[PDB]
């Protein structure tokens, strides 16, 4: 009826004060959690660098204690996951997506200490994983905890506070409030029905958790005749997005064969992967890590074309292994790394081929940063605003879109699925079937 619309239109954007205020506490706790996590990852990563000083002269021993420290922290991580919270392996983002569909439980009393001390091990182990995973999952749970702790009722209360937690989490993981908001109202939220997620509360929670992050952690241009080059980048990003999704899902299966569910086969498998990272963290330190390290070095062009081909392959290999194996840790930040490295590499070719454009590989590096998100995750808008939050190069805002849409078109037409949805569907299907 037209009569209900009028009633609805006039009563629009009135969120209850008790939910708004609780969004403020959620945000304050998520940002705190997020920071503590971050600090602990840094501390451990460091201790490990300090071990390679006390064994600096003996090179075989050096390479041994590079493997063992990480393998021990990974193993300690997988153990917390398998023994206490199997829901808290992998990213965590899909497991919250479900909780918003009301299809997956939010076991905060379990996931919080697991995901936190688990990722602390795997990330501190120097694995190729993000902070987004642990912070988004924890975020949602921190929102779920204060729902239950104040036994607040209603669908608005439950989705709003479960969304502001998840958004506040990402904001902290990238010092990026806007990306948090857009991530909620683009990828996270229930995609096929209406929901009562209050965006104002999401605004509050994001603000608080960014402030908490701030308290303890304080390119050229692109003319028209150059635009088609960003389309192409995107196309190439779109053909490879599904391929990457298929490998990560493929590799999910091909590693379940190695341990068949067995807690001790799994932990030991993790141990050898986590150890492989600690090792590559020394002998080849760009092939390991969550991948942030090399975004500014690649945006310049201090890397050569040879080294770029090398990193991209190695990082793909090592992103799959760490994530496909179901370690606690994201794939979001490593996709920014992969996105940059490839975009850089394209920009370098583009520079030498078309001198009449007077290119800078660094624009293609910035266009390509949030492109693999657009193709694998199918959340282009967030990756564009995240990367525009971090680097803002405005003159690039059109190139950055064209590339994103290009990859989002070719992710569809080449038979790719959104990567978080594909994992949730896997998890609902494995559960039912």
């Amino acid at each position, epitope marked *: 009826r037209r009569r209900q619309l009028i009633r609805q239109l006039l009563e629009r954007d009135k969120t209850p004060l008790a939910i708004l205020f609780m969004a403020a506490v959620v945000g304050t706790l998520v940002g705190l959690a997020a920071v503590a996590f971050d600090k602990g990852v840094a501390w451990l990563q460091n201790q490990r660098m300090g071990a390679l000083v006390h064994t600096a002269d003996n090179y075989p021993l050096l390479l041994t204690v590079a493997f063992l420290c990480s393998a021990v922290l990974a193993m300690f991580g997988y153990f917390l996951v398998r023994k206490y919270a199997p829901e808290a392996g992998g990213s965590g983002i899909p497991e919250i997506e479900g909780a918003l569909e009301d299809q997956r439980p939010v076991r905060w009393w379990r996931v919080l200490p697991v995901k936190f001390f688990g990722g602390l091990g795997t990330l501190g182990g120097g694995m190729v994983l993000g902070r987004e995973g642990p912070t988004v999952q924890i975020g949602g749970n921190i929102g779920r905890m204060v729902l239950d702790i104040f036994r607040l009722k209603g669908d608005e209360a439950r989705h709003t506070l479960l969304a502001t937690g998840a958004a506040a989490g990402l904001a902290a993981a990238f010092n990026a409030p806007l990306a948090g908001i857009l991530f909620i109202i683009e990828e996270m939220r229930p995609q096929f029905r209406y929901t009562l997620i209050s965006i104002k509360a999401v605004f509050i929670g994001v603000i608080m958790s960014t402030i908490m992050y701030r308290i303890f952690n304080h390119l050229s241009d692109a003319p028209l005749n150059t635009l088609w080059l960003y389309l192409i980048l995107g196309i190439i990003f779109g053909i490879f997005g599904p391929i990457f999704n298929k490998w990560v899902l493929g590799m999910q299966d091909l590693l379940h064969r190695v341990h068949g569910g067995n807690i001790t086969k799994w932990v030991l498998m993790g141990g050898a992967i986590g150890g492989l990272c600690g090792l590559l963290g020394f002998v080849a330190p760009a092939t390991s890590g969550g991948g942030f390290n090399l975004i500014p070095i690649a945006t310049a*062009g201090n890397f050569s074309m040879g080294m770029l081909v090398f990193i991209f392959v190695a990082r793909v290999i090592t992103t799959l292994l760490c994530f496909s194996s179901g370690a606690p840790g994201g794939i979001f930040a490593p996709m920014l790394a992969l996105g940059t490295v490839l975009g850089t590499a394209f920009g370098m070719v583009a520079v030498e081929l078309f001198p*009449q454009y007077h290119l800078e590989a660094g624009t293609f590096a910035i266009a390509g940063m949030g492109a693999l998100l657009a193709a694998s995750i199918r959340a282009p808008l967030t990756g564009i605003i995240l990367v525009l939050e971090m680097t803002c190069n405005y003159q690039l805002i059109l190139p950055m879109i064209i590339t994103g849409l290009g990859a989002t078109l070719l992710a569809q037409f080449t038979g790719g699925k959104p990567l978080y949805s594909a994992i949730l569907a896997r998890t609902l299907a494995k559960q039912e079937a």
Partner: antibody
Amino acid sequence: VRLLESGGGLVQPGGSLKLSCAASGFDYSRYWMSWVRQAPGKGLKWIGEINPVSSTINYTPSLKDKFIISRDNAKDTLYLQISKVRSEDTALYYCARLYYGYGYWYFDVWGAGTTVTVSS
Amino acid sequence: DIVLTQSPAIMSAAPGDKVTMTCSASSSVSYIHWYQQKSGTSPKRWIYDTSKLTSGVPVRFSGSGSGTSYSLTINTMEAEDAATYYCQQWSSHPQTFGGGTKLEILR
């Protein structure tokens, strides 16, 4: 905007000299700079160009180190060294700022030039 | 690398007359540029991207072309329009200029 090149004058065949173009009026970074020479009563001929970070420096098909372009964002100046100077380098040497419209690049603003002469 | 040939090397017309020169490329070009060089002073940018005027150029001046043929045109020439006009492309690399057309007053 004003480009004011110095350095010209008389040199002997075989010798080598360094012309200078001193930029004022604008932010000297953010701009590609470029040299173009004009031999007596004849055409404009492009010599080379240089991006702001000096990470890209192209020349017209020349002999290796005939021409070395370089810039100084601190001093706000564009340099051009020439070597093996022979009579074909006797010309009026314009420096110039580069920009564009659709992205087919033009020579935006030119200096008055400096004359070089190669005579024994 | 693109050779631009400008048709009349020298020409003349009396102030008030419709003047039109030509820039003809060896291979194909797109979006060319025109410069006005008076004796003793710097070449000034005049017309760019084939037909856009430079902020300052009077509207009597205009440009048009495609393929391998373009043309600067002066609908009603003035006294001050006598000069040397060089066409230049950078659709291909390296960029190139024409030999120029010298436009002179007819009295």
